[PDB]
From Swiss-Prot, chain B:
Effect annotated for changing T83A: Partial loss of O-glycosylation by host GALNT1
Subunit description: Binds to host ACE2. RBD also interacts with the N-linked glycan on 'Asn-90' of ACE2. Cleavage of S generates a polybasic C-terminal sequence on S1 that binds to host Neuropilin-1 (NRP1) and Neuropilin-2 (NRP2) receptors. Interacts with host integrin alpha-5/beta-1 (ITGA5:ITGB1) and with ACE2 in complex with integrin alpha-5/beta-1 (ITGA5:ITGB1). May interact via cytoplasmic c-terminus with M protein. May interact (via N-terminus) with host bilirubin and biliverdin, thereby preventing antibody binding to the SARS-CoV-2 spike NTD via an allosteric mechanism.
Disulfide bond annotation, renumbered to this chain: C24-C56, C69-C78
Glycan-carrying positions: N10, N23, N64, T83
Protein name: Spike protein S1
Positions of region (Disordered): 28-47
Gene: S
Known outcome of mutating H62Y: In strain: Gamma/P.1, 19B/501T, 19B/501Y, Omicron/BA.1, Omicron/BA.2, Omicron/BA.2.12.1, Omicron/BA.2.75, Omicron/BA.4, Omicron/BA.5, Omicron/BQ.1.1, Omicron/XBB.1.5, Omicron/EG.5.1
Function recorded in the entry: Attaches the virion to the cell membrane by interacting with host receptor, initiating the infection. The major receptor is host ACE2. When S2/S2' has been cleaved, binding to the receptor triggers direct fusion at the cell membrane. When S2/S2' has not been cleaved, binding to the receptor results in internalization of the virus by endocytosis using host TFRC and GRM2 and leading to fusion of the virion membrane with the host endosomal membrane. Alternatively, may use NRP1/NRP2 and integrin as entry receptors.
From-to range in the entire protein, with total length: 594 to 690 of 1273
């Protein structure tokens, strides 16, 4: 389900919790904070 | 590790292999010139070698469509058996 472009939610606000396209990782603002807060190790990237 | 992808014994004998966590340059170096743990090398010729995040996928034609997962592979990749077949 795709959120409608118009954010007419009767004054309620969700911009921070909704995804922002500008982010290369389509993550909500709060999600980005969670990612940074966790000191992840062994990400499992392909590397080379 | 080396894992084998199959759609069923008799649905087809065609199968694909995955070198999880490997680069798609050593499996070519794993050609019959040097005998690694795998003995078969006919598919080591490639002609359809595909590199993905999970590892090196060989023998499986790479498409650019989207469908529900058929057989899990990893890192956002699932393979199926569709059409030609
Ligand atoms: C939610 O409330 C506000 C007012 O309508 C709007 O969301 C707000 O968007 C700004 C982004 O501009 C957030 O911070 C601001 O950033 C700018 C730079 O872009 C900065 O110059 C400002 O000083 C400010 O810090 C702001 O935190 C954010 N607030 C909230 C509650 O999300 C948005 O219009 C409203 N969204 C909805 C669905 O009503
Ligand atoms: C798997 O093996 C191949 C080849 O061994 C690797 O290909 C290499 O990829 C890097 C870039 O990702 C190439 O380095 C490049 O060098 C130029 C200058 O020559 C630089 O301007 C670029 O920014 C980049 O750093 C490299 O030439 C290329 N070949 C080799 C032998 O390294 C590949 O990276 C390995 N991993 C994967 C996922 O393919
Ligand atoms: C699935 O579709 C995408 C396109 O949305 C394929 O990516 C690339 O698409 C272009 C145009 O069809 C292919 O043509 C080539 O484009 C390059 C761009 O650098 C150009 O230099 C060449 O002269 C040629 O016109 C391109 O080969 C194709 N593949 C790339 C860029 O890697 C994608 O290949 C398709 N996936 C498949 C067939 O598995
Ligand atoms: C052999 O073919 C039938 C097709 O209905 C099915 O049982 C399956 O594809 C095969 N049997 C197996 C894998 O045990």
């Amino acid at each position: 389900y795709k959120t409608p472009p118009i954010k007419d939610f009767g004054g309620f606000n969700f911009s921070q919790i909704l995804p922002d396209p500008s982010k290369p990782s389509k993550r909500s603002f709060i999600e980005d904070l969670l990612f940074n807060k966790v000191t992840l190790a062994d990400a499992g990237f392909i590397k080379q | 590790g080396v894992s084998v992808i199959t759609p069923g014994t008799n649905t087809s004998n065609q199968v694909a292999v995955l070198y999880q966590g490997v680069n798609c340059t050593e499996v070519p170096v794993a050609i019959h010139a040097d005998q690694l743990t795998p003995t078969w090398r006919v598919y080591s010729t490639g002609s359809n070698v595909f590199q993905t995040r999970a590892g090196c996928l060989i023998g499986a034609e790479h498409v650019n469509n989207s469908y529900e997962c058929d057989i899990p592979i990893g890192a956002g990749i699932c393979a199926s058996y569709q059409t030609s077949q």
